[PDB]
Design a protein around this ligand. Sequence first.
Ligand SMILES: OC[C@H]1O[C@@H](O[C@H]2[C@H](O)[C@@H](O)[C@H](O)O[C@@H]2CO)[C@H](O)[C@@H](O)[C@H]1O
Ligand code: CA
Length: 225
Amino acid sequence: FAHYPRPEGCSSPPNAVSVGLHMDLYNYPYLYVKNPGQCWNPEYQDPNFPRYGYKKYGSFGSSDHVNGKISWDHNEFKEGCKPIMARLPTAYNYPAKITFSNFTMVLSGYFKPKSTGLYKFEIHADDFILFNFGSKNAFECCNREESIDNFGPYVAYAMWPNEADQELEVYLFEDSYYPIRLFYNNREYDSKFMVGFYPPNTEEITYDFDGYLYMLDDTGNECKD
Ligand SMILES: OC[C@H]1O[C@@H](O[C@H]2[C@H](O)[C@@H](O)[C@H](O)O[C@@H]2CO)[C@H](O)[C@@H](O)[C@H]1O
Ligand SMILES: [Ca+2]
């Protein structure tokens, strides 16, 4: 905390590497819906929700090779307490409309820095973003699918309205693929999933992950082979 974080990453040969992150989409129902108390579900506030509670309403979709402009800011919605259909950014490779007003998303895979140095990430959430990062915080090297819910204490915890903005700095090495797990929830209305970073020596933030997101084969033995 007085020094900067220096997380652990993974090694892999080039032949086991493909582009983009994996996405799972989960239902997050309203308590009740109006027209043709509070309406929204507080379950996302449960401490157990990020580790297993988030699957309890079932899934509805998934995609792979998620890459590029993965952030969004949907503040155009007009009606609350009501499902609103919209499409994810094309980065997600998911054509169907989702209940953008109310859904849960888990994004996982690997971050590779374009140069060795200190990276600062910034998240802005409506409603809820969790950020895990590193082979000892997000998931095990080459064992993502089996270990995806064994993440550690959060690297950033962003919740609307109060802690909605968070930041963190990690010194990362160019040659290494760092496990990354991004958890997102919208409970209702407006939806903001904004994840950006300032690369080393860079003043302007970027929200474009193109060339930074990769997937490794889940071949196990800490990627030996
Ligand atoms: O301001 C973002 C915040 O809005 C809440 O939704 C409100 C909505 O703004 C209001 O127009 C409607 O009448 O009631 C809603 C609350 O029941 C969201 O709940 C919150 O998640 C954010 O989206
Ligand atoms: Ca919301």
